[PDB]
Structures are given as C-alpha cells and as structure tokens.
Amino acid sequence: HLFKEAQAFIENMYKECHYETQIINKRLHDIELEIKETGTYTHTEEELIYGAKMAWRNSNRCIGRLFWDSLNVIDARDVTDEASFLSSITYHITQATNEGKLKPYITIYAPKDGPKIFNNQLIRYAGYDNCGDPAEKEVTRLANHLGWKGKGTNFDVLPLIYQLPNESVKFYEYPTSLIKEVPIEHNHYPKLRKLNLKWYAVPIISNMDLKIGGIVYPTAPFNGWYMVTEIGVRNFIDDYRYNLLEKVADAFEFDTLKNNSFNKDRALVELNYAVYHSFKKEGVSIVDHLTAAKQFELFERNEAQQGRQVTGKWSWLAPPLSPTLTSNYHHGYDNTVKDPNFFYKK
Amino acid sequence: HHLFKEAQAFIENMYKECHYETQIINKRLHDIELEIKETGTYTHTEEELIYGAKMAWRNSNRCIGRLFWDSLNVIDARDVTDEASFLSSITYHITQATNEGKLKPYITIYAPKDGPKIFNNQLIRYAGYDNCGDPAEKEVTRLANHLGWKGKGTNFDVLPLIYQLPNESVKFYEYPTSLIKEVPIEHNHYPKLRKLNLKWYAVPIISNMDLKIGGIVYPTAPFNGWYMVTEIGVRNFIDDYRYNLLEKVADAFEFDTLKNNSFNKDRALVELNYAVYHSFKKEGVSIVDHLTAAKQFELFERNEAQQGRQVTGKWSWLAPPLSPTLTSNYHHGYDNTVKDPNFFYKK
Numbered sequence: 001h002l003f004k005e006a007q008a009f010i011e012n013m014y015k016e017c018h019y020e021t022q023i024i025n026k027r028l029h030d031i032e033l034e035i036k037e038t039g040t041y042t043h044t045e046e047e048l049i050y051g052a053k054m055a056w057r058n059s060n061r062c063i064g065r066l067f068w069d070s071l072n073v074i075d076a077r078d079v080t081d082e083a084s085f086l087s088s089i090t091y092h093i094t095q096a097t098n099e100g101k102l103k104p105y106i107t108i109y110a111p112k113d114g115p116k117i118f119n120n121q122l123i124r125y126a127g128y129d130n131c132g133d134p135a136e137k138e139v140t141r142l143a144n145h146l147g148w149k150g151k152g153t154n155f156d157v158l159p160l161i162y163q164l165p166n167e168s169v170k171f172y173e174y175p176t177s178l179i180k181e182v183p184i185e186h187n188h189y190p191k192l193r194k195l196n197l198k199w200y201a202v203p204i205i206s207n208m209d210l211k212i213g214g215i216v217y218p219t220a221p222f223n224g225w226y227m228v229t230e231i232g233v234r235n236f237i238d239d240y241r242y243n244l245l246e247k248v249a250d251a252f253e254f255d256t257l258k259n260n261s262f263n264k265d266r267a268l269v270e271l272n273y274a275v276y277h278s279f280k281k282e283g284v285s286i287v288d289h290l291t292a293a294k295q296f297e298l299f300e301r302n303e304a305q306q307g308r309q310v311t312g313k314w315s316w317l318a319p320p321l322s323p324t325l326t327s328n329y330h331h332g333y334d335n336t337v338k339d340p341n342f343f344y345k346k
Numbered sequence: 347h348h349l350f351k352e353a354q355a356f357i358e359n360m361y362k363e364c365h366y367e368t369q370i371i372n373k374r375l376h377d378i379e380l381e382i383k384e385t386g387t388y389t390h391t392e393e394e395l396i397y398g399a400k401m402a403w404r405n406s407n408r409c410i411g412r413l414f415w416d417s418l419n420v421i422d423a424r425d426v427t428d429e430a431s432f433l434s435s436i437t438y439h440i441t442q443a444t445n446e447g448k449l450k451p452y453i454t455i456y457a458p459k460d461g462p463k464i465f466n467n468q469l470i471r472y473a474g475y476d477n478c479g480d481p482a483e484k485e486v487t488r489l490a491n492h493l494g495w496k497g498k499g500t501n502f503d504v505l506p507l508i509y510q511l512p513n514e515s516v517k518f519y520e521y522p523t524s525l526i527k528e529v530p531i532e533h534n535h536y537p538k539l540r541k542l543n544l545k546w547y548a549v550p551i552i553s554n555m556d557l558k559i560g561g562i563v564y565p566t567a568p569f570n571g572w573y574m575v576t577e578i579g580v581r582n583f584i585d586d587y588r589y590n591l592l593e594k595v596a597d598a599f600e601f602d603t604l605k606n607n608s609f610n611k612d613r614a615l616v617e618l619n620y621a622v623y624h625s626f627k628k629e630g631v632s633i634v635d636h637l638t639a640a641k642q643f644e645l646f647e648r649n650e651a652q653q654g655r656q657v658t659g660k661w662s663w664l665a666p667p668l669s670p671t672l673t674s675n676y677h678h679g680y681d682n683t684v685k686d687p688n689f690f691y692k693k
C-alpha cells in the first residue's frame with residue numbers, strides 16, 4: 001500500500017515535470033528497494049519541495065492557492081538537536097516576516113523521531129479566564145503548567161511549546177522584537193484605537209500533518225499572509241473568540257445593535273476596514289476578502305491551462321463577509337481530497 | 347407495493363406523533379392497502395393532507411423559517427377541476443396570504459392526478475426581458491408573450507399566471523392590480539435611492555415544486571411565507587445574473603469608489619438591505635431580517651429537541667449572504683438527510 005501511494009506521487013510529479021518515463025522507472029526502482037530495506041522510503045529534496053507545493057495546491061479550504069508555486073520550502077529533516085531546532089523556528093519567523101512583505105514558508109522536519117510542536121500556530125495569544133483568546137485556553141494551561149508565566153494581558157504571545165525525542169516537553173519564549181504586531185485603528189473612528197486591539201502579522205499553522213506520497217510529516221509549520229475576515233470577523237467577533245462586537249460598536253458610535261438597525265452588520269464592515277488599513281499602515285501584507293477571490297479565479301484559470309481540475313470546499317472558500325460578491329459563492333466545488341495534502345492530527 | 351411501503355412509513359411516523367393507538371394505525375393502513383389494490387394509489391385523509399403538508403415544511407433542509415411550520419394554513423383543493431374555480435382559488439390564496447400586509451403562510455394543494463397545471467416559478471414574479479427585468483424570468487416571460495400576454499415593458503412587470511387544465515390549451519391570466527401588493531424601496535438617509543424606482547412584491551409563493559406525502563406526489567401545490575431581507579436586498583437586487591444593481595445603488599448611497607479595499611461594496615450591500623427592510627415596514631408588509639430569522643431558527647431546534655426529533659438541514663442555504671457569522675447555524679454542520687414528506691424541484 002505504501003508503494004502504491006508512493007507510485008502515484010512519483011508519476012504525477014514527474015509527468016508534471018516532463019521527465020522521461022525512463023528515470024521515472026529508475027526512481028520507482030530505488031524506492032521499492034528501501035521500502036523493503038527500511039519500511040518506508042525517503043523523498044529526494046526535489047520531491048519534498050514539489051510535494052509541499054502540491055499539498056498547498058490541493059488544500060481545498062484554501063482561497064489563496066494562486067501563489068502555491070511561490071512557497072519557500074525548508075528541508076529540516078536533519079534537525080535533531082534543541083539548538084538547531086529552535087534556530088530553525090526563529091529563522092522561519094524572521095524570513096517569513098520579511099520586514100512586512102510576508103513570504104510563504106514551510107519548514108519540514110523529520111517524518112520520524114523528529115521535533116514535536118504543540119502550538120496551534122507558532123504565534124498565538126494566550127487565553128485566560130477573564131481575557132485573551134478563548135481558543136488558546138488549552139495550549140495556555142499547558143504553558144502555565146510547564147512554568148511559563150505571561151503578563152496576563154489580552155495579547156500575551158504564547159511561547160513555542162515543543163518536545164524532542166527522549167526528552168520532556170519544554171517551552172521557549174520568543175523575544176518580543178521577533179514578533180511583529182499591528183495596532184488596530186480606524187481613521188474615521190478615533191475611539192477604536194482606545195480599545196488597544198492588535199494582531200500578529202504572520203499566521204503559521206503548526207498543528208497539521210503534511211502527507212506526501214504515503215509519507216506523513218507530523219511537524220512542518222507553514223505560513224502565508226492574512227485575509228481580513230480572518231482577523232476582523234472570526235478572531236475579533238466570533239462569540240467564542242474575542243467577542244468584541246459590543247465594544248467595537250461603541251467605538252463606531254452606534255446607539256443600538258438591534259437586528260433591525262443593521263448596525264451589527266455595519267460594525268463588521270467597519271472593523272474589517274480598520275483591520276485592513278491598519279495593516280496597510282504598518283506595512284504588513286494583507287488581502288481583502290473580495291480581492292482574495294479574484295486571485296482565486298486566476299488560480300482556477302492557471303490550473304485549467306495546465307490541464308488540472310480544481311477541487312475545494314465551498315463553505316470555506318466563501319468569505320464571512322459579502323460572500324455573494326465572490327465568484328466561488330455561485331457554484332459548487334469538488335471537495336475531493338488528493339495527495340499530497342495537509343490533514344488535521346487525529 | 348413500493349407505494350404502500352412509503353404510505354405506511356408516513357402513516358406510522360405521523361400517527362405516532364399524534365399519539366394514536368396502534369389499532370387506529372393498523373385500521374388505516376388496511377384501508378390504504380385496500381384502495382391501492384383496487385385503484386392504483388390511495389387518497390389522503392384531510393387530516394393527513396394538513397399534517398402531511400406541515401411535516402413537508404418541517405423537513406425542508408433549505409428553509410430557515412421552519413419555526414412556524416406548525417402554523418401552516420392548508421387549503422385542500424383536490425376537487426378543483428374547472429378553470430373558473432381554479433383561478434378563483436388562486437386569487438383566494440393570494441388574498442388570504444397577503445392579508446393586507448400581515449402575511450400568513452398558506453399552501454393550496456390541487457389534485458395529484460389530472461389537476462390544474464402551473465408554469466410560473468412563483469405565482470408572483472417580475473418579467474424578464476433582453477434589456478431589462480429579471481433575467482431569471484426570461485423563459486417564463488417568453489412563454490407569456492407567446493401566449494399573447496404583453497406587459498408595459500418595465501423592470502417590474504408583474505407576470506401573469508400561466509396554467510393548463512386537462513385537455514385544454516395553455517392559457518395565461520393577469521391578476522387584478524389591487525391583488526398584487528408591492529413595496530417601493532427607499533432609504534431614509536439616502537434620498538437618491540428613491541430615484542431608482544425600485545420595488546418588490548410582498549408575497550413569495552413558490553409554485554414550481556412537487557409536494558410528496560407518503561408516496562403521493564402533488565405536482566401543483568403552491569406555498570408561501572414572508573420574505574427575509576437578504577433574499578431581496580442581496581440576491582434579487584445584487585446578483586449579476588439578476589438585477590445587478592450594485593453600481594447604481596452605490597451611486598445612490600454616494601460612494602466615490604467601489605475599489606475592493608475601500609469596502610464600499612460591502613457598505614452598499616448593508617445599506618440596501620436596511621432600505622429594503624424598513625421599506626417593507628413603512629408599507630406595513632411582514633418581513634424579517636437575516637439575524638432575527640436565524641434566532642428564530644434556534645428556537646425551532648429547541649422545540650424539535652423537546653419533541654424527540656432531530657434537525658436536518660443544508661448549511662450553505664441556512665447561512666445568510668450577509669454577516670453569516672452572526673447566526674448560530676454558521677458555526678456547525680447540518681445533517682442534510684432528506685426525509686418524507688418533503689418538497690422537491692420538478693425534474
């Protein structure tokens with residue numbers, strides 16, 4: 001079964017790379033071998049780089065796949081000592097941030113006996129009883145249990161929580177200078193700044209499994225740049241998250257929030273307008289929900305031109321703001337999940 | 347036989363819900379089994395027809411307004427076979443449904459075999475032309491024109507009923523003006539919007555679906571409820587394959603630009619729904635906003651739990667096309683199993 005998934009991957013990659021049937025066979029030969037010698041096989045560095053790009057390209061729930069081939073992949077399968085591991089994490093965050101103009105990065109670690117990461121994202125705000133991000137409560141209790149103690153504000157950057165093989169779980173705090181943050185303000189509603197809201201620049205998912213032709217990489221944090229509604233609608237407004245609708249509505253001076261007023265709806269638009277332009281002011285990359293969809297159309301065009309069909313999960317590709325104003329809203333998608341890809345941990 | 351299976355499942359589900367003794371159910375199943383052998387199908391007890399229609403609305407996975415299923419006003423018109431009575435029954439439904447603005451949910455079920463045939467998508471819809479009107483009603487408008495119907499050629503020409511009684515040509519019938527309640531759209535804060543001369547009808551009456559109850563298919567059974575703001579303010583007015591009014595409306599709201607990062611497109615959308623909502627309110631026509639409708643759906647789920655029934659649904663349709671994250675249904679999935687009785691699109 002392993003060789004079967006492996007074969008599938010090699011064929012697709014090489015066919016897409018216009019490789020002579022000849023070498024394809026040689027490669028399958030080499031693989032079939034070490035699968036017997038070992039139990040699994042090892043991807044060439046070209047396959048690892050191409051496999052991760054393909055995984056992003058098959059990520060059905062991703063609206064930003066237009067830039068899939070832009071991924072900067074880092075082979076860290078050899079990282080086994082604490083110093084180099086930590087060094088690789090900070091390097092990723094530093095190179096991804098790129099002084100504001102974010103760059104797609106993925107740091108792939110060893111598929112077996114490798115560094116384990118417990119964070120949902122390399123960068124997240126703690127979640128406490130009376131403040132913080134409710135979604136990060138679990139990971140925050142773990143941090144505290146380990147000995148970590150944050151300032152206790154609404155935006156305490158959680159530390160990297162990791163564990164090397166044959167060692168206990170540890171946590172590492174990033175120097176604040178490493179994490180770029182964006183104060184949120186509205187150039188038409190002075191009172192918004194008074195709420196002291198802000199968000200980090202780079203979203204680095206570190207709790208998913210990367211699968212390339214049979215091999216499963218349990219640790220391979222990756223990042224892109226935000227799309228307004230992620231911060232302005234879900235992070236800040238979801239009732240199970242920061243749930244700031246009321247405080248923000250006040251900053252916008254809406255005397256009421258009765259459903260009849262449609263102020264709840266106006267507050268959402270304004271908040272995303274503030275988030276977007278606050279990021280723009282800090283020189284940090286961000287894309288608005290509608291532009292993000294236009295870029296997605298191009299992705300679809302670029303794929304059809306390469307003879308590939310487009311898969312996707314409708315409910316995710318559609319933004320939580322003026323969804324009908326996006327092309328993808330008006331038709332369905334084939335949610336078929338292909339390999340390579342990213343999956344949730346069991 | 348296949349028919350009896352479905353009739354039985356319906357009878358059992360229904361009578362069980364009404365707490366009817368086992369003997370009552372078995373007696374009914376006998377009578378049904380009997381008349382299927384003697385005639386091909388069976389006839390629904392008037393009670394079964396009324397409760398069956400309500401179970402159909404309650405099982406409709408795509409409907410956010412199911413909290414009111416219990417209140418459906420069912421009209422049995424399986425006896426109507428002549429034209430004059432057919433039309434009369436239509437104006438009656440429209441009359442009762444509208445109720446001068448205090449809209450009431452109604453459904454008229456005609457004969458399941460050899461009954462009146464209806465071609466409209468909704469009893470009330472605006473004509474669709476090549477240079478104006480509702481693009482969605484092009485096909486139906488072509489038919490109306492072919493039959494000799496001729497409208498003033500505006501963006502809002504109320505189409506005529508198009509029907510056909512057995513062994514008779516397809517005809518069209520124009521509703522009296524007084525019969526069709528309409529609402530002019532205007533925004534209190536934006537006087538320029540009135541200048542667009544927009545409006546919409548009060549009652550949404552679906553007339554293009556099949557009602558299925560215990561194996562019995564009722565092809566002609568128009569139903570209605572009242573509108574939820576986004577159906578008009580977002581889809582009907584803004585979809586590019588509908589009236590496509592974003593640019594025009596934006597100008598009425600005086601937006602200097604519609605470039606994406608300006609977010610005016612989104613403000614324009616919220617403002618247009620605010621207009622549509624209060625316009626209906628000003629004219630005294632029932633309407634519910636998207637968020638309020640979703641709150642009522644929460645109640646529906648609470649009531650259904652208390653009745654031992656599970657709730658099915660189609661997520662993408664339940665989530666409104668405006669600030670969907672502000673509705674509870676957006677944050678979890680829904681079992682889209684289609685149970686009977688139910689409504690179906692005509693094949």
Ligand code: HEM
Pocket residue numbers: 052055056059061062063064065067071104105106222223224225226227230234287292316342
């Ligand atoms: C370049 C900028 C990018 C943009 C703007 C973009 C945008 C998005 C958005 C809006 C989501 C929805 C998140 C949510 O609301 O839950 C998402 C999900 C996703 N994206 Fe992208 N993306 C980008 C880069 C990346 C990269 C680099 C990868 C892969 C290496 C990727 C993989 C995915 C995956 C796996 C999901 C689903 C994750 C989940 O299940 O929660 N994205 N992306």
Ligand code: HEM
Pocket residue numbers: 402403406408409410411412414418451452453569570571572573574577634639663689
């Ligand atoms: C009493 C007020 C009601 C409200 C506010 C309500 C609201 C809605 C909404 C918002 C939709 C989606 C429309 C669209 O986007 O195309 C819908 C669909 C639906 N509703 Fe309701 N509804 C009501 C009454 C009814 C009644 C009385 C019935 C059944 C006898 C019903 C049957 C359905 C069905 C079958 C659909 C799907 C129709 C389609 O496929 O286009 N609804 N309703």
Ligand SMILES: OC[C@H]1O[C@@](CO)(O[C@H]2O[C@H](CO)[C@@H](O)[C@H](O)[C@H]2O)[C@@H](O)[C@@H]1O
Pocket residue numbers: 300308309310311312331332333334335
């Ligand atoms: O936009 C992509 C999305 O559209 C659907 C709608 O059914 O299919 C269309 O696009 C495909 C290309 O990805 C074509 O293969 C297909 O023929 C066309 O109808 C979805 O299947 C697809 O996910």
Ligand SMILES: OC[C@H]1O[C@@](CO)(O[C@H]2O[C@H](CO)[C@@H](O)[C@H](O)[C@H]2O)[C@@H](O)[C@@H]1O
Pocket residue numbers: 647656657658659678679680681682
């Ligand atoms: O809300 C209905 C919807 O919820 C799901 C999961 O999203 O089912 C869970 O919640 C129901 C509460 O209404 C329970 O009856 C059900 O047992 C539970 O699993 C869907 O399956 C359902 O469509």
